[PDB]
Design a protein around this ligand. Structure first.
Ligand code: YO1
Ligand code: CL
Lengths: 163, 166
């Protein structure tokens, strides 16, 4: 048997006004089915009919969904990204100075917003952000949001700065 | 001053092809560890070859590392390639033929190093064709070396397998 991977909608993607501080558009759990039952392997974002997640979560596997089978459209192993059904749509960038919110969706746990200041690390062309928190395996792909609710990164990836 | 990580490496084993694998600071393979208020966690893996430590850029964010020898400074780094080398230029130049089985020398957090023989898939990227290992391991296994039959490192787990022609 090949791995039976599917997505389930977990909630809306919204900035939460008083967060904790350290089918349709939304945030989805990426699940695997075994005879013994289901495991969450990651998270992703449906935007403009395109499902976005990390390449390591699916390794280009087709996904079952409420809308039928989703086939991979584009991916990059090095950036660790993959899109289903169409081109990559998550084009927002972090300004490199505003606090962000991680919309963490860990396995077997409630979706929640956590406000956090990314770390900044120097690169040769500039700087990149990091949200490295203590979340369980399977949280990778959780969206990182700016104050307008735009997805500026996925949990486990560097947060790209444009400034 | 700014954001910093307290990172260190620990040798996990020799890098060798294992003749009868399951089929689905000396040179060697190392765990990359980070010290946080919660404790020390493995965040990835890398390869010491010819006195140069090699890992994926995102594992270390290009940070200096502590080792048995003292401080290792990043020498070369590329966020786009997601690679970084310490102490000297990138030394891992072997490529996959695009058809032979390979071995992942997986070094997962809290688990023994082990060799798994597998056949990479081949995927189209804007740069060209690349191989990729279709085995699932936890995030902190990223950087584990992928080996050809002569024990040469032809890729790092999560970074793809380099194909000799395009
Ligand atoms: N100054 C430098 C000093 C170094 N020590 C160094 N090492 N480099 C490596 C590059 C690739 C690989 S690898 O694939 O073989 N991965 C693995 N091999 C075994 C295990 S993993 C390994 C090492 C690179 C340097 N500069 N490099 C540049 C590369 C590209 C471009 S580019 O503009 O042309 N963009 C692109 N186009 C198509 C693709 S990238 C500009 C500059
Ligand atoms: Cl890989």
């Amino acid at each position: 048997s090949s791995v039976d991977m599917y997505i389930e909608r977990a909630g809306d993607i919204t900035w939460e006004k008083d967060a904790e501080v350290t089918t349709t558009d939304g945030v989805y759990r990426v699940m695997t089915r075994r005879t013994s039952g289901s495991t969450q392997v990651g998270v992703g974002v449906m935007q403009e009919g395109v499902f976005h997640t990390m390449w390591h979560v699916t390794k280009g596997s087709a996904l079952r969904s409420g809308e039928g089978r989703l086939d991979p459209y584009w991916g990059d192993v090095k950036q660790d990204l993959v899109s289903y059904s169409g081109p990559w749509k998550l084009d927002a960038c972090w300004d490199g100075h505003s606090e962000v919110q991680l919309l963490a969706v860990p396995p077997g746990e409630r979706a929640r917003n956590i406000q956090t200041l990314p770390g900044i690390f120097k690169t040769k062309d500039g700087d990149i952000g990091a949200v490295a928190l203590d979340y369980p395996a399977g949280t990778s792909g959780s969206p990182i949001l700016d104050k307008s609710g735009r997805v500026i990164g996925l949990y486990g990836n560097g947060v790209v700065i444009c400034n």
